Paper text:
Mycobacterium tuberculosis (Mtb) WhiB3 is an iron–sulfur cluster-containing transcription factor belonging to a subclass of the WhiB-Like (Wbl) family that is widely distributed in the phylum Actinobacteria. WhiB3 plays a crucial role in the survival and pathogenesis of Mtb. It binds to the conserved region 4 of the principal sigma factor (σA4) in the RNA polymerase holoenzyme to regulate gene expression like other known Wbl proteins in Mtb. These structures reveal that the WhiB3:σA4 complex shares a molecular interface similar to other structurally characterized Wbl proteins and also possesses a subclass-specific Arg-rich DNA-binding motif.
We also generated a truncated WhiB3, denoted WhiB3TR, without the C-terminal residues (aa 91–102) containing the putative DNA binding motif to improve the protein stability and crystallizability. Two crystal forms were observed from the same crystallization drop, with the larger crystals in the P43212 form and the small ones in the R3 form. However, in the crystals, the His6-tags in the N-terminal σA4-βtip of three WhiB3:σA4-βtip complexes are “glued” together by multiple nickel ions from the crystallization solution, resulting in a trimer of the WhiB3:σA4-βtip complexes in both crystal forms. Three WhiB3:σA4-βtip complexes in the trimer form are found in the asymmetric unit of the P43212 structure. The crystal structures of the WhiB3:σA4-βtip complex in the P43212 and R3 forms are essentially identical except for the N-terminal loop region, with an average Cα root-mean-square deviation of 0.27 Å for WhiB3 and 0.42 Å for σA4, respectively. First, the N-terminal residues (aa 446–456) of σA4 in the WhiB3:σA4-βtip trimer form a β-hairpin with the His6-tag residues, instead of being part of helix hs1 of σA4 as expected. Because the residues 446 to 456 of σA4 are far from the WhiB3 binding site, we do not anticipate this structural change affects the mode of WhiB3 binding to σA4. Second, βtip in the WhiB3:σA4-βtip complex, which was expected to form intramolecular contacts with σA4 in the σA4-βtip chimera, sticks into a neighboring protomer of the trimer and forms intermolecular interactions with σA4 in a second WhiB3:σA4-βtip complex. The resulting σA4-βtipʹ, however, resembles σA4-βtip observed in the WhiB7:σA4-βtip complex and the RNAP holoenzyme, and thus it is used for the following structural analysis.
Residue numbers in the entry:
A (entry chain C), B (entry chain A): 15 to 89
C (entry chain E): 14 to 89
D (entry chain D), E (entry chain B), F (entry chain F): 439 to 546
The structure:
Amino acid sequence: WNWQLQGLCRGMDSSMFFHPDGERGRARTQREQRAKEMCRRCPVIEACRSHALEVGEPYGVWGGLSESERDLLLK
Amino acid sequence: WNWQLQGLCRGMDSSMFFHPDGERGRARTQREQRAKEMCRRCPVIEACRSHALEVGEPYGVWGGLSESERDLLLK
Amino acid sequence: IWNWQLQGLCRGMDSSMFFHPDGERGRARTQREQRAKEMCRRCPVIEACRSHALEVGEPYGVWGGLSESERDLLLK
Amino acid sequence: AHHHHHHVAVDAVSFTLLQDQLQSVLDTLSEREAGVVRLRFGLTDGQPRTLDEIGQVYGVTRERIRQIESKTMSKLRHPSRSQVLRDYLDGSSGSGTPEERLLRAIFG
Amino acid sequence: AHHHHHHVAVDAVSFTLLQDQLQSVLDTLSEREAGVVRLRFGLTDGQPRTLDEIGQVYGVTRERIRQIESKTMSKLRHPSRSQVLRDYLDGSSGSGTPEERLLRAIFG
Amino acid sequence: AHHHHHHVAVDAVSFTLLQDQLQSVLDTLSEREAGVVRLRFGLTDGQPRTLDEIGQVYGVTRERIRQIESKTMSKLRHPSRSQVLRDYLDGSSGSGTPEERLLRAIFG
Ligand code: SF4
Ligand code: SF4
Ligand code: SF4
Ligand code: NI
Ligand code: NI
Ligand code: NI
Ligand code: NI
Ligand code: NI
Ligand code: NI
Ligand code: NI
């Protein structure tokens, strides 16, 4: 996934982009917001978003979108 | 040997097509007849025959022919 | 390695023919170099071997009928 | 000592996959994620396990194991950690071997 | 534990040949046929043996060993049993490895 | 038993490099030359050593080790030893394997 070589998150901790089991409510929103702040500075946000929508990636923030936001777009 | 992917004998035992050492007389003829009955139901008999004649396969029934029948054709 | 070296006359020779033992000087060094050069000057690929050694500045050994010190002088 | 590898083709594409780099991929996951992957694909004993079998090991439902496997695959593909995966898939290069160092020195 | 393999070229054609699958090819032969093949090609101790050496092992003539080898090669190529041989020659595919299952799951 | 090998690419060029044939290349060098090569490239313990570390092993200066390494690389490239090295770089052929003998016999 060629675009991935330019991802801004490449050298960051992946826990930034995936929620621990059981994380809900304010803690989940806070983590999601921090991830999206990075995506919205990333040169491949549109390619990342496209990938995640095309294959329906079931977990994680991708392309500045949460999984629930992607689900709404796909349904 | 890509014709071989269609051979009718693929899923049968090879002892059908090769005589045990020392087998002579009626047992030999009987085995050969059972092999040929399968070749003559096989969709690649002509390709199998062609292979065996081209390289002079020294043992076995191939292409509905015994070794001795192939030897006569190659003489 | 895949071109001129296939014809080298020294292939399989003890490399000691073409390389001096550490610290060898004087007559023993000269005699060894002379024996190596005698082979190079019967070799079908002496010019290619010489060219390689000069192009990359091979630091040790007789190559192409030239000693290391002869090559150094040429490259200076 | 480091040589164990497998040649695998997927479609027209060939990969050389080193066991040591597979271990590095698994080391990036949690204990439970890596354990689910090892059991599901038969990485240790060669026998891929059913969701029921894995659920029994971890004291969770079949559906929970499905969720763990699904999330783990998303993690492996995510750009934040997929570099370890790209390195695994590029095992044919021999990047990092003693042999590569030796060939660099001989060939200049 | 299953990785032992050899890269071999014959003409313009390359093969990756797994020891485990070679073992399966030999398992399809009789004990004497497999033993003659192992000795003739040096599969066990690396030393290919002469017909006289093999005759001495089995207590038969050189001509008998020639006949056994000849018949065995016909059997290996015969369509009735050659499936095992095709799978051996296709070892580069990595069909049936844990790694292939993992890559199927990652790549979808 | 003989299978240990590494796949390495240099530029667009691929090599399959057998440990047994690397040993043959090293066997052509003196004890100190082969020892400096093993240490420098990490052929044994995987840890490539500095010139100072190697100098300590051999009781000589860093400059002396640089000279030994330089001379050894010249020797390895010299046409007088080029056959042993060509055979090493041609490991993908599987020349000399039992498998090559078996395939020759099956394919005629
Ligand atoms: S858009 Fe977000 S998740 Fe995708 S590569 Fe960029 S930073 Fe990473
Ligand atoms: S012709 Fe006979 S031996 Fe040949 S593939 Fe068909 S059944 Fe088998
Ligand atoms: S010129 Fe000398 S060193 Fe070079 S290949 Fe010929 S004999 Fe060997
Ligand atoms: Ni190893
Ligand atoms: Ni190694
Ligand atoms: Ni390999
Ligand atoms: Ni193994
Ligand atoms: Ni393995
Ligand atoms: Ni081995
Ligand atoms: Ni082997």
